[PDB]
Design a protein around this motif. Sequence first.
Motif, PDB file in Angstrom:
ATOM      1  N   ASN A 143       0.851  -1.227   0.000  1.00 41.47           N
ATOM      2  CA  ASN A 143       0.000   0.000   0.000  1.00 41.47           C
ATOM      3  C   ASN A 143       0.873   1.260   0.000  1.00 41.47           C
ATOM      4  O   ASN A 143       0.315   2.352   0.008  1.00 41.47           O
ATOM      5  CB  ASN A 143      -0.901   0.091   1.239  1.00 41.47           C
ATOM      6  N   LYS A 185       7.643  11.387   3.788  1.00 38.59           N
ATOM      7  CA  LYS A 185       6.234  10.905   3.735  1.00 38.59           C
ATOM      8  C   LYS A 185       6.007   9.790   4.772  1.00 38.59           C
ATOM      9  O   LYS A 185       4.879   9.675   5.245  1.00 38.59           O
ATOM     10  CB  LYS A 185       5.821  10.490   2.319  1.00 38.59           C
ATOM     11  N   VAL A 190      -1.150   9.535  11.408  1.00 41.14           N
ATOM     12  CA  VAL A 190      -1.841   8.288  11.843  1.00 41.14           C
ATOM     13  C   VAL A 190      -2.041   8.330  13.362  1.00 41.14           C
ATOM     14  O   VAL A 190      -3.169   8.079  13.827  1.00 41.14           O
ATOM     15  CB  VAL A 190      -1.054   7.025  11.438  1.00 41.14           C
ATOM     16  N   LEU A 236     -12.936   8.148   8.988  1.00 42.81           N
ATOM     17  CA  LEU A 236     -11.783   7.346   8.522  1.00 42.81           C
ATOM     18  C   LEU A 236     -12.152   6.673   7.201  1.00 42.81           C
ATOM     19  O   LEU A 236     -11.319   6.681   6.287  1.00 42.81           O
ATOM     20  CB  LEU A 236     -11.364   6.300   9.562  1.00 42.81           C
TER      21      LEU A 236
HETATM   22  C1  HEM Z   1      -5.970   4.533  12.868  1.00 41.14           C
HETATM   23  C2  HEM Z   1      -5.319   4.251  11.723  1.00 41.14           C
HETATM   24  C3  HEM Z   1      -4.946   5.212  10.619  1.00 41.14           C
HETATM   25  C4  HEM Z   1      -5.046   6.552  10.573  1.00 41.14           C
HETATM   26  C5  HEM Z   1      -5.537   7.421  11.710  1.00 41.14           C
HETATM   27  C6  HEM Z   1      -4.616   6.972   9.300  1.00 41.14           C
HETATM   28  C7  HEM Z   1      -4.614   8.317   9.034  1.00 41.14           C
HETATM   29  C8  HEM Z   1      -4.157   8.799   7.875  1.00 41.14           C
HETATM   30  C9  HEM Z   1      -4.075  10.154   7.676  1.00 41.14           C
HETATM   31  C10 HEM Z   1      -4.483  11.212   8.696  1.00 41.14           C
HETATM   32  C11 HEM Z   1      -3.606  10.287   6.421  1.00 41.14           C
HETATM   33  C12 HEM Z   1      -3.366  11.643   5.836  1.00 41.14           C
HETATM   34  C13 HEM Z   1      -2.077  12.227   6.442  1.00 41.14           C
HETATM   35  C14 HEM Z   1      -1.292  12.892   5.337  1.00 41.14           C
HETATM   36  O1  HEM Z   1      -1.026  12.254   4.267  1.00 41.14           O
HETATM   37  O2  HEM Z   1      -0.922  14.078   5.514  1.00 41.14           O
HETATM   38  C15 HEM Z   1      -3.385   8.980   5.836  1.00 41.14           C
HETATM   39  C16 HEM Z   1      -2.870   8.647   4.597  1.00 41.14           C
HETATM   40  C17 HEM Z   1      -2.606   7.335   4.196  1.00 41.14           C
HETATM   41  N1  HEM Z   1      -2.829   6.217   4.882  1.00 41.14           N
HETATM   42 FE1  HEM Z   1      -3.519   6.143   6.547  1.00 41.14          FE
HETATM   43  N2  HEM Z   1      -4.231   5.969   8.498  1.00 41.14           N
HETATM   44  C18 HEM Z   1      -4.412   4.873   9.277  1.00 41.14           C
HETATM   45  C19 HEM Z   1      -4.194   3.547   8.978  1.00 41.14           C
HETATM   46  C20 HEM Z   1      -3.683   3.204   7.767  1.00 41.14           C
HETATM   47  C21 HEM Z   1      -3.332   1.878   7.437  1.00 41.14           C
HETATM   48  C22 HEM Z   1      -3.522   0.678   8.346  1.00 41.14           C
HETATM   49  C23 HEM Z   1      -2.809   1.925   6.159  1.00 41.14           C
HETATM   50  C24 HEM Z   1      -2.306   0.784   5.357  1.00 41.14           C
HETATM   51  C25 HEM Z   1      -2.147  -0.457   5.851  1.00 41.14           C
HETATM   52  C26 HEM Z   1      -2.853   3.294   5.740  1.00 41.14           C
HETATM   53  C27 HEM Z   1      -2.459   3.779   4.539  1.00 41.14           C
HETATM   54  C28 HEM Z   1      -2.443   5.131   4.190  1.00 41.14           C
HETATM   55  C29 HEM Z   1      -1.906   5.557   2.929  1.00 41.14           C
HETATM   56  C30 HEM Z   1      -1.381   4.572   1.907  1.00 41.14           C
HETATM   57  C31 HEM Z   1      -1.987   6.923   2.922  1.00 41.14           C
HETATM   58  C32 HEM Z   1      -1.572   7.885   1.849  1.00 41.14           C
HETATM   59  C33 HEM Z   1      -0.343   7.434   1.030  1.00 41.14           C
HETATM   60  C34 HEM Z   1       0.994   7.838   1.636  1.00 41.14           C
HETATM   61  O3  HEM Z   1       1.325   7.464   2.790  1.00 41.14           O
HETATM   62  O4  HEM Z   1       1.787   8.551   0.973  1.00 41.14           O
HETATM   63  N3  HEM Z   1      -3.388   4.052   6.738  1.00 41.14           N
HETATM   64  N4  HEM Z   1      -3.742   8.099   6.786  1.00 41.14           N
END
Ligand code: HEM
Length: 137
Positions: free
Chosen positions: A34, A51, A59, A83
Motif C-alpha cells: 500500500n 512521507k 496516523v 476514517l
Molecule cells: C488509525 C489508523 C490510521 C489513521 C488514523 C490513518 C490516518 C491517515 C491520515 C491522517 C492520512 C493523511 C495524512 C497525510 O497524508 O498528511 C493517511 C494517509 C494514508 N494512509 Fe492512513 N491511516 C491509518 C491507517 C492506515 C493503514 C492501516 C494503512 C495501510 C495499511 C494506511 C495507509 C495510508 C496511505 C497509503 C496513505 C496515503 C499514502 C501515503 O502514505 O503517501 N493508513 N492516513
Amino acid sequence: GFKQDIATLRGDLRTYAQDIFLAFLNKYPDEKRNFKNYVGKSDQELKSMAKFGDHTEKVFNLMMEVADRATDCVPLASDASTLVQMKQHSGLTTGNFEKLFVALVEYMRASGQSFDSQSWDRFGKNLVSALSSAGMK
Ligand code: HEM
C-alpha cells in the motif's frame, strides 16, 4: 489503563508512532504494498523518508483522538465514518487496520511498561467493527 496510555503515547508520540508503525511493517511485510516508496528500506532509512515521518505522525495524532473520544474502548461511529471516507484510504480493507492493532498490542506486550494491552486489543477490534459498519470493505 487505556486513558493513561493515550497520555503516555502522546508524551513521546513521534517515537511511539514510528516504532509501532515499523513493528507493523516488519511483522506484515506484504503491507508495504500500500506504500511502494517504503520497499527495500531499513527502519533507519524509512524514518529518513519525509512521507513516512509525516504520515506516521498523522496516523498516531488521529488514532489518539479516536481513542480519546472512545467510551470503554468503543470508538465514535462519526470517527469510523470520517476514517472510511478518507480518499487516501480508497485501497484499504479492515484487514489493514486489524494488522496495525495486532502489531500495536504486541509492541505494548514487549515494552517494559504498564500499558493496558488488553484495552488496546479491544479498541482495535471495536474500531475494525465500526469501520465495517461505516462502509469499509
Ligand atoms: C488509525 C489508523 C490510521 C489513521 C488514523 C490513518 C490516518 C491517515 C491520515 C491522517 C492520512 C493523511 C495524512 C497525510 O497524508 O498528511 C493517511 C494517509 C494514508 N494512509 Fe492512513 N491511516 C491509518 C491507517 C492506515 C493503514 C492501516 C494503512 C495501510 C495499511 C494506511 C495507509 C495510508 C496511505 C497509503 C496513505 C496515503 C499514502 C501515503 O502514505 O503517501 N493508513 N492516513
